[PDB]
Write a protein that binds this ligand. Sequence first.
Ligand code: HEM
Ligand SMILES: O=C1O[C@H]([C@@H](O)CO)C(O)=C1O
Length: 293
Amino acid sequence: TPLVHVASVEKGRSYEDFQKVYNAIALKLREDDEADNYIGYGPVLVRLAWHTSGTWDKHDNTGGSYGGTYRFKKEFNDPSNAGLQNGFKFLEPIHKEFPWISSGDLFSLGGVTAVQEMQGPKIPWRCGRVDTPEDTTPDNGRLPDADKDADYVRTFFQRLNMNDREVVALMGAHALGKTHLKRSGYEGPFGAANNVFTNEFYLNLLNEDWKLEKNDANNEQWDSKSGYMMLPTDYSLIQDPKYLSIVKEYANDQDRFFKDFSKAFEKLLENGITFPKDAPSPFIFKTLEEQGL
Ligand code: HEM
Ligand SMILES: O=C1O[C@H]([C@@H](O)CO)C(O)=C1O
């Protein structure tokens, strides 16, 4: 039997405590509005949560969000994580304000807060991740390659126990922010609204005119007449006929896309964690806007 990670709620903490940590991330998001040319820290926090979760292997329960291992040099220096140090740095003063929260809880809560605060769906979220030692840090190379096709994508995500719908849903996070040539070898915004969470990823894939080109690091990307880009793995969602059908469904139903993404994103952030029968129910946090804050 693989490793077992039992959710253990930070001693004495309840929903109100975590709503505070959320509110502090949310306030700071509002505050550092100007970053990445007025994109903000929203997207990088969404990406930080996915990457700290996306090391999971279903086969042996190694990696995943539970251990908060990104805080160790091997994981924070992962070439795939280039840039994410900004997300870490952003969450640093949050963690000094709320030092009782585990690292895994913080990184994953950062992703939740970012989505909700960019007008994304509500993402139920559970506390109880527990910091694990350095020797538990997963090796580099577990996050995906961008220069690949649909067959790669489908296989890759099987290791995260994600099916076709879950893959297409999670990839709509590429409505957010942009690629940076210095970080990934790709350059450009994915779409128009860079820090507002919509189903624009699917609509753009279908409606724009894309042209495959070599960028300034000699990597291939799909470039639109409108000035957007897609990764080869992004564009594969319309080259594969099963993916294409789901792309069309999300392009044509914002509510279903929100619903599906919420489920898949909670699932991604919870993979590898055992929650006790007596654990609290997932928390649905209020936005600042819903609190009047
Ligand atoms: C086939 C799978 C995926 C590949 C190959 C991939 C690859 C990439 C690359 C190369 C970048 C640009 C990094 C940079 O230069 O700043 C990027 C950005 C981003 N990714 Fe993905 N990604 C994948 C799936 C996902 C998923 C599942 C999520 C979250 C649910 C996600 C969220 C993001 C976000 C928010 C950004 C923009 C961050 C920013 O603006 O700094 N990606 N992705
Ligand atoms: O959301 C984002 O945050 C980082 C930026 O803040 C780094 O300074 C980034 O790349 C985004 O698009």
